Ligand binder design. Structure first.
Ligand SMILES: Nc1ncnc2c1ncn2[C@@H]1O[C@H](COP(=O)(O)OP(=O)(O)OP(O)(O)=S)[C@@H](O)[C@H]1O
Ligand SMILES: Nc1ncnc2c1ncn2[C@@H]1O[C@H](COP(=O)(O)OP(=O)(O)OP(O)(O)=S)[C@@H](O)[C@H]1O
Ligand SMILES: Nc1ncnc2c1ncn2[C@@H]1O[C@H](COP(=O)(O)OP(=O)(O)OP(O)(O)=S)[C@@H](O)[C@H]1O
Ligand SMILES: Nc1ncnc2c1ncn2[C@@H]1O[C@H](COP(=O)(O)OP(=O)(O)OP(O)(O)=S)[C@@H](O)[C@H]1O
Ligand SMILES: [Zn+2]
Ligand SMILES: [Zn+2]
Ligand SMILES: [Zn+2]
Ligand SMILES: [Zn+2]
Lengths: 199, 208, 211, 208
């Protein structure tokens, strides 16, 4: 009765650094490549109201100051069945199918993080030491990106880059949405192949 | 072509608890910050007659009675996709609906099909609550006693203070997070919520 | 007491299709026993998720420090009781009842760290096999060509499957026991694993039978 | 108040050689003749849970590596003097140990203070010994093969036969006599030495 383990990225950084933008954009890149929307979870999640099998789920400020969420998140990313709590009985009993889970913590178990990354602000866009949001938001003239319709220093790597703690590698918003898509495509390719033989 | 989804507040309480003067007051407070006026939607509204780009548009006695045509239009009001409203005379027809906030009122317990994306257009839904000092003989608001001014003003958003406002007489309970709010601080929170709702949305949506 | 779970390790170079074999073998064994499969991660510290699925699978078993891997895996494949570690305390306390373990590694590296005993853990594998890619499905780089290898066959002569593809037959990929130098496909390896577990459930029937 | 020392068997062999299935299979063949059951002691026993007056008590991995606490009670297992054991719950507390035999198993080469009057509690001390035809690739036994039923039965103690029982697979060689036995004949022997144990004492110590 079961499914493929969602691909997961945690972005880690001290506040003010643009973590929630990083996830908003990444999530919706991915969501758009699959012709879907983003389901965006409030902090201290209790109920999943709004969840109608969106392709990506984003968790903001995961693990704030009693470990409910790490137990909620642990059944979001697995192959076991998970049917999340809902407030109104009208939509209760829907299965949690999201292919990706994007999330952010603060700065300073893991196995389900396909990628575990630090957010970093490059210095032209650093500000009195946290990001300059209006000046990094304004749009690049060129677009070299794999995943976007038009570009901006949040996407490029100009303002913010993502640094994976496990592999030491740098990414941008754009290349990591490409790396999250590749890895899932790997996973579905296998599973769909092996599911095929038992239907 | 689209806009930012107005931060909506509706108030629920037994009749006469004051939720109509609540909306009227927190409506125009927001409209004095933004140098605009307020458009008052009539109950069971057929048309938007006389609406000119007000930063606030209130909606009183929402869902007052069936057929609930108020719900087709409300969902069209608090939303990202673009709307040109129903209008009687063809002089002012076509105005795009620009209101930054939408405030409403309804009755105490009444549940007002698709039951979830419908209530995320409430950023905030309060149960109006009246202090016993100002609660009257049948349990509603004594508005003669409650409208007399306070000697000092601790409020950020008003030129003068009254217990309607500093919460002595009138208070608002979050239904989600069950918060005790005076109306001076429910205007703080809604203008604060669309101050940053303007920030995040337009940088994001630019990329798509 | 419990029966020693019967264990298959599969060694090969990257791109030769190890986790498709472990995947497919595991879920064929799962279905005959009307159960599901449990997948450990790499460098695995904990079993959260273990409902006592009949088959546990360790992908990429060797992480090549391997102190952790072998000393825990020594504890899973054994006749004694085993209570695995957990992170949630909700399902902490469950016992490891899986009847098969299917694992994958890389070829001709040194398995156990010392640590060791090298003999003590090596008898724990009932079958130790090399995954070989037949030369019509090796692409350049010697990698399994997985797209064609998945294409279903039009004849099905198989013990354990309803549909057939070169991943099952032995057309595309095969496993050969190191100790036996005899060849299996994923279909014939499944049949062998099921036979062994049958033979390990026999020995209790036959000890009682004499009283 | 005391009674006859249980004739004891200890088996010795490398791990996997089968001496655990041996102790329990000879334990059960004795306890069927005497209509008893077997009380299986866990490794490193802290208490005897639910031991109720079985004829046979099997002690496994005896003289285990941690404390030799296995020795403290074993010395009071087969002995002359009365023993009421340690118990978790006070539901069964005070029941004396009447088991007529005690069978153990150890490791192969491990020597397990006052050594002499104690090694006499083994009536028989044995080395488990595994036939090449049944000896596994690395020297253990193939219990899969070795458990196949024999077409024949010339065993005196069992309802069917198997190479564990008839010596074809599994064999026991005494340390003193160096006589090699199957388990079928070495169960004939222990009950036989018990018969000797029972007869000689009752006449005699009725005098003292
Ligand atoms: N007044 C507030 N009360 C409670 N939570 C708030 C408030 N203002 C913002 N937040 C939360 O703050 C979070 C954003 O975290 P920040 O403090 O901005 O750190 P940050 O995410 O690294 O900075 P970003 O990514 O540019 S928003 C969001 O999830 C909001 O829900
Ligand atoms: N023209 C008026 N101007 C100011 N206050 C008024 C006026 N008419 C009545 N009031 C009083 O001011 C209050 C206005 O808010 P309310 O009418 O109590 O809110 P509400 O009664 O819950 O909403 P509804 O739709 O009228 S039931 C009432 O309690 C009246 O007693
Ligand atoms: N140079 C490399 N760097 C990192 N990962 C690699 C590299 N080469 C191969 N891999 C990975 O290692 C796996 C090799 O295992 P295989 O024997 O080929 O079976 P597979 O189907 O190719 O992969 P599995 O099944 O997930 S273990 C591949 O799946 C790749 O994801
Ligand atoms: N539940 C079981 N029922 C029957 N046989 C079993 C069972 N579990 C394991 N076996 C096998 O039956 C034999 C039991 O005897 P053994 O335990 O090997 O003797 P031993 O290994 O020297 O003693 P120890 O204390 O277990 S090291 C072994 O070959 C086991 O592999
Ligand atoms: Zn750019
Ligand atoms: Zn006041
Ligand atoms: Zn085929
Ligand atoms: Zn025989």
């Amino acid at each position: 009765k079961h499914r493929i383990e969602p691909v997961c990225l945690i972005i880690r950084g001290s506040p003010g650094t643009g973590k929630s933008l990083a996830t908003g954009i990444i999530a919706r890149a991915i969501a758009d490549k699959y012709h879907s929307s983003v389901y965006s979870l409030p902090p201290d999640p209790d109920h999943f109201d709004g969840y109608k099998q969106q392709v990506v789920t984003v968790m903001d400020d995961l693990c704030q100051n009693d470990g409910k969420d790490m137990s909620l998140f642990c059944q979001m990313v697995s192959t076991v069945d998970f049917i999340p709590p809902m407030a109104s009985l009208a939509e209760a009993g829907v299965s949690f199918t999201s292919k990706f889970v994007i999330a952010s913590t603060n700065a300073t178990i893991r196995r389900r993080f396909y990628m575990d990354c630090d957010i970093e602000v490059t210095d032209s866009y650093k500000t009195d030491g946290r990001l300059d949001a209006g000046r990094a938001a304004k749009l690049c003239s060129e677009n070299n990106t794999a995943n976007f319709k038009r570009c901006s220093p949040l996407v490029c790597g100009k303002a913010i880059q993502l640094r994976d703690r496990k592999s030491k590698v740098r990414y941008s918003v754009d290349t990591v949405v490409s790396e999250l898509i590749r890895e899932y495509s790997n996973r579905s390719a296998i599973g769909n192949t092996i599911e095929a033989l038992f239907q």
